[PDB]
Amino acid sequence: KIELTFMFRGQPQEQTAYKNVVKKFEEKHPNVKVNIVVTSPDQYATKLRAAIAGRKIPDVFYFNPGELRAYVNSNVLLDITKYVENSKGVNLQDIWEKGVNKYRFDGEKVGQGNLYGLPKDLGPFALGYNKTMFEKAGIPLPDKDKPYTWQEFIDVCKKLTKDTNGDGKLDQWGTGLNATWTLQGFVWSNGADWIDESKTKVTVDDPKFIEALQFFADMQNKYKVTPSIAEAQTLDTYQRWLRGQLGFFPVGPWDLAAFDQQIKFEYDLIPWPAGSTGKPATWVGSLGIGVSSMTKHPKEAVELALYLSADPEGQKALVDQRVQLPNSVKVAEEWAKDPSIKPANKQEFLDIINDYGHSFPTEYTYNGEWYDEFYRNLQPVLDGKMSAEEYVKKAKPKMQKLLDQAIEQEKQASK
Numbered sequence: 047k048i049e050l051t052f053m054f055r056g057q058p059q060e061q062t063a064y065k066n067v068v069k070k071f072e073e074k075h076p077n078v079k080v081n082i083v084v085t086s087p088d089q090y091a092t093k094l095r096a097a098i099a100g101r102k103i104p105d106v107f108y109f110n111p112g113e114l115r116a117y118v119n120s121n122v123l124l125d126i127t128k129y130v131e132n133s134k135g136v137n138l139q140d141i142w143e144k145g146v147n148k149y150r151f152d153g154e155k156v157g158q159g160n161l162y163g164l165p166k167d168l169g170p171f172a173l174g175y176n177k178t179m180f181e182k183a184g185i186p187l188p189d190k191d192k193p194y195t196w197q198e199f200i201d202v203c204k205k206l207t208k209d210t211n212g213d214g215k216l217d218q219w220g221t222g223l224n225a226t227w228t229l230q231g232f233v234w235s236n237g238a239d240w241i242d243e244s245k246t247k248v249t250v251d252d253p254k255f256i257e258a259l260q261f262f263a264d265m266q267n268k269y270k271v272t273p274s275i276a277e278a279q280t281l282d283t284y285q286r287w288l289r290g291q292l293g294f295f296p297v298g299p300w301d302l303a304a305f306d307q308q309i310k311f312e313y314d315l316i317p318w319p320a321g322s323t324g325k326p327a328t329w330v331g332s333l334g335i336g337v338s339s340m341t342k343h344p345k346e347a348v349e350l351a352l353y354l355s356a357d358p359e360g361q362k363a364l365v366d367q368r369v370q371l372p373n374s375v376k377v378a379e380e381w382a383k384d385p386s387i388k389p390a391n392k393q394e395f396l397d398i399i400n401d402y403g404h405s406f407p408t409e410y411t412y413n414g415e416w417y418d419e420f421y422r423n424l425q426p427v428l429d430g431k432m433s434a435e436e437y438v439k440k441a442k443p444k445m446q447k448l449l450d451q452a453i454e455q456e457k458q459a460s461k
């Protein structure tokens with residue numbers, strides 16, 4: 047008779063997986079009915095923001111770790127600490143500490159104190175390569191541990207870029223990376239970032255940042271190891287990767303079900319190519335599962351969040367359905383070692399989590415508007431109409447004003 051609203055986002059394979067697992071929850075808890083509100087990833091932020099603006103908050107919902115402090119200040123998230131402590135069996139200490147701590151807040155800083163959510167997952171963003179394509183081309187396979195240098199990466203990408211059917215037109219390319227999701231690793235491995243150490247000053251005008259951004263754009267425009275601008279418009283590079291047209295493309299654990307369904311070639315994971323630091327870099331994503339401060343059924347709502355995040359039965363179902371890696375550290379370690387589950391080097395996901403993955407810069411700031419502004423007007427750089435140097439000099443003060451406002455608005459909302 048109890049009814050909960052569960053609001054979340056996902057690609058089609060993720061929507062199916064979580065709907066299936068919510069049904070398992072309902073089977074286990076016959077007195078609870080869960081009403082689903084689900085959107086595409088791109089639609090989610092707008093829809094959640096509207097719910098919160100109207101103070102019509104779903105009982106259980108996904109949220110961005112960068113919004114944690116703002117959600118606490120505006121009393122959006124229930125303090126679920128005591129419900130989790132009283133729960134039968136589940137020990138959050140089995141779960142990735144990096145994941146759990148993103149949703150703790152002690153009143154002053156993130157990473158400690160009361161629980162205001164549970165981790166949906168950790169989302170290490172690995173680099174995949176098309177092994178079928180390498181072996182057909184006679185090119186030595188990438189090393190599973192030692193990153194390519196940037197020059198080595200371009201060299202191999204050039205070797206892979208060719209006319210394979212002999213009609214005179216290129217139909218296979220080295221790569222086709224999306225700057226929204228893959229620029230970070232190049233910036234970070236080149237010893238740069240969007241913001242400084244203190245997370246209060248924009249640093250995109252760092253020569254190291256400029257070099258990374260120019261290199262990124264140059265893959266398409268200068269080195270020409272990607273589909274052309276027109277070709278990517280015709281069919282985007284994610285789809286071209288699925289069809290076996292690209293040598294390299296990123297892989298997150300949420301991709302695995304989609305790739306199981308659509309990818310017919312053999313692929314495996316490798317470290318990202320490394321810039322001046324010689325150390326690979328990429329991001330580790332996460333989403334939180336939160337409970338509305340205003341929920342009429344806090345026990346049942348926390349029980350649902352726990353089922354998805356930490357319950358061994360719920361987690362097993364999500365992992366079996368190939369939309370994430372295990373939240374339990376020990377389960378993830380034995381998962382990675384199981385050779386019957388592909389990719390062969392899915393250990394790379396854990397290496398990202400444990401060693402060379404970083405957080406998105408917005409996880410450190412009170413809101414992410416300053417960062418969104420960088421990407422909003424980036425495309426002319428990517429299409430070779432504006433230099434990286436010219437763009438970051440123009441973007442920097444716009445970004446800085448927004449970041450300054452985030453910092454101030456924190457001070458005001460936290461009183």
Ligand SMILES: OC[C@@H]1O[C@@H](OC[C@@H]2O[C@@H](OC[C@@H]3O[C@@H](OC[C@@H]4O[C@@H](OC[C@@H]5O[C@@H](OC[C@@H]6O[C@@H](O)[C@H](O)[C@H]6O)[C@H](O)[C@H]5O)[C@H](O)[C@H]4O)[C@H](O)[C@H]3O)[C@H](O)[C@H]2O)[C@H](O)[C@H]1O
Pocket residue numbers: 056057087109110111112166167168169170224225226227278279282283284285296297298300301330331332333406409
């Ligand atoms: O800019 C050029 C564009 O390319 C063309 O569009 C094609 C695009 O390709 C398709 O997208 C493929 C997917 O994109 C990458 O995945 C990125 C995002 O990950 C998924 O979410 C997983 C989720 O996020 C992780 O957390 C990350 C962050 O961490 C926190 O700070 C914050 O809260 C999180 O946001 C979690 O760990 C994990 O659960 C999203 O689904 C996806 O967007 C992968 O390559 C593919 O999965 C799609 O069709 C187009 O977007 C166009 O021409 C042009 O726009």
Ligand SMILES: [Ca+2]
Pocket residue numbers: 209210211212213214215216217
């Ligand atoms: Ca051809």
